[PDB]
Amino acid sequence: SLTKQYLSVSNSIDETVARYKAQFTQLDTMMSKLNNTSSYLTQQFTA
Amino acid sequence: LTSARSRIEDSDYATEVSNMSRAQILQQAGTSVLAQANQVPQNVLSLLR
Structure with missing residues (x-):
């Protein structure tokens, strides 16, 4: 047993x-998509 | 029973975190665009001048 x-x-x-x-x-x-989202923020402030 | 309870009650980060992402992304884009709208009637006024 x-x-x-x-x-x-x-x-x-x-x-x-x-x-x-x-x-x-x-x-x-999720950290990787958060890095992708930080890159999105990058495009957003480049705007 | 603990497994059943857990599966009924627990939340999956693999979904909620990206939900947070989309939402806050929209928040920031919304802030920028909102800023933009104010310029429109300012241009209207400058034209009026």
């Missing part, structure tokens, strides 16, 4: 890492 429990929790912690990495992949997507 110990072996079973450890194996069951291993992949769980790994996919928790994956989920946080997903939140932060999209965080970087």
